[PDB]
Amino acid sequence: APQQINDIVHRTITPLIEQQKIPGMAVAVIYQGKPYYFTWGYADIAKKQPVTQQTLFELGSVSKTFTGVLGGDAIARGEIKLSDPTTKYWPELTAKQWNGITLLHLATYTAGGLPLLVPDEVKSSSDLLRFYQNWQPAWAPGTQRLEANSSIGLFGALAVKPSGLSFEQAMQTRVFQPLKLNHTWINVPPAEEKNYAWGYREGKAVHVSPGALDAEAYGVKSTIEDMARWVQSNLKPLDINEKTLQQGIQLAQSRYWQTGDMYQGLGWEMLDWPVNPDSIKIALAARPVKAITPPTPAVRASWVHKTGATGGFGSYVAFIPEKELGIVMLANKNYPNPARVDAAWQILNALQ
């Protein structure tokens, strides 16, 4: 590819792999709408399979960008509304604390302290009902943001309900297919197992385990190729043929709440571009939010991104719609979010 692109990429990621002792990594850079690929290390140390443009990485929380979009698509389809109480799609949600809790609240982590992880002992639909029924809000809805799987995850599950499709049923046919992401899955087919990389946590090959609402919050696995297309799709949403998926993408990039200089979308998070590097280990930051009334439409001059991880994988997606620029980073080792963002900024800012 262009030697300029080739050079920041290699000069930033190389030491990054060395300092963080990252087994395998994949990187895509979207320059003026064209993807450039890079690959290092191993997808499976034991079998010496290297990382390739075909390797599957666990996206972790980056999965929330898909849930965000799929939900925006359901809104566009008129199957759900963000202004609707959560009880509309789950009538058995009788506890009185759900009253003024809307789908917008679930989707944006502002319901009032929904826990970061759904408890491991919640292993059944009925288990899931009781958990949400018995949850006690630490705060009033629309006052604080506490990032959580159990918040966005229930939103994903409720958003596809009117449709009658499973979440994965809706994801495939309403988002992966339309977008030609043929190597992106919530569940990896046996046919793709030879591309599924192992994650590395403390020296052992690990894969994410099943959990409640896992497909909706941290479940998708994908290649740098499909991720590149995913970034391409979120950069230029007007070039998408299926009309609700177009609207859906834009809605996910809308600004619903503001905290510091960070804005909260559906899955995606945004910062006004140009952005200061200072701005971009605290397992839990509760942050009050200012409501953006009404929500601002997706802003070209943003730095839209999202981190995500699992026991064995660390990933990051960042793109500036206005510069038609973007990057994707996928490693099979969970390493410091900050190093991810530094590397992202260094590459991208060096290309305008």
Active site residues: 61
Segment 1 to 30, residues that bind ligand CXU, using CB under 6 A: none
- Each residue 33-72 as x (binds ligand CXU by CB under 6 A) or -, in order, gives ---------------------------xx-----------
Rule CB under 6 A: is residue 79 a binding residue for ligand CXU? no
- Residue 303's H or E segment, with its range, is strand 302-309
Sequence-distant (≥ 6) Cβ neighbours of residue 258 within 8 angstroms: 264, 289, 290, 292
Considering only the stretches 15-23, 126-134, 194-202, 302-310, report the one whose residues sit in contact with ligand CXU under the rule CB under 6 A: 302-310
Cβ closest to ligand CXU, residue 234 vs residue 246: 234
- Strand bridging mode 199-201 / 204-206: antiparallel
Breaks (C-N over 2.5 A) in the chain follow: 280
Work out whether 253 is an interface residue with ligand CXU (CB under 6 A).
no
Instruction: Tell how far CA 319 is from the center of its chain.
Output: 13
Binding mask 192-231 for ligand CXU (x = CB under 6 A): ----------------x---------x-------------
Closest approach of ligand CXU to the CB of residue 198, in Å: 15
Among 167, 310, 317, 345, which residue interacts with ligand CXU (rule: CB under 6 A)? Answer: 310
Residue selected from 149, 246, 253, 264 as contacting ligand CXU according to rule CB under 6 A:
149
Q: Among 95, 259, 75, 93, which Cα is nearest to 156's?
A: 75
| Binder of ligand CXU out of 41, 85, 137, 311 (CB under 6 A) | 311
Distance, in Å, from the CA atom of 76 to the CA atom of 162, rounded to the nearest integer, reads: 13
Query: C-beta of 334: minimal distance to ligand CXU in Å?
Result: 6
Residue 203 near residue 33 (C-beta atoms within 8 A): no
- Options 97-105, 222-230, 261-269, 309-317: segment touching ligand CXU (CB under 6 A): 309-317
Distance between CA atoms of residues 6 and 36, nearest Å: 9
Residue 279's Cα: distance from chain center in Å? 20
Cβ 48 to ligand CXU, closest distance in Å?
27
Amino acid at 111: A
Alpha helix ranges (H) inside the chain: 3-20, 64-76, 103-108, 125-134, 149-159, 167-171, 214-217, 224-235, 243-252, 337-349
What letter does residue 202 receive in the DSSP assignment? T
Applying CB under 6 A, does 156 fall inside the site for ligand CXU?
no
Give the per-residue contact string, 87-116, with ligand CXU (x = CB under 6 A; - = no): -----------------------------x
Q: Which is nearer to ligand CXU, 109 or 176 (CB)?
A: 109
Contacts with ligand CXU by CB under 6 A lie at 60-61, 116-117, 147, 149, 208, 218, 307-311, 334, 337
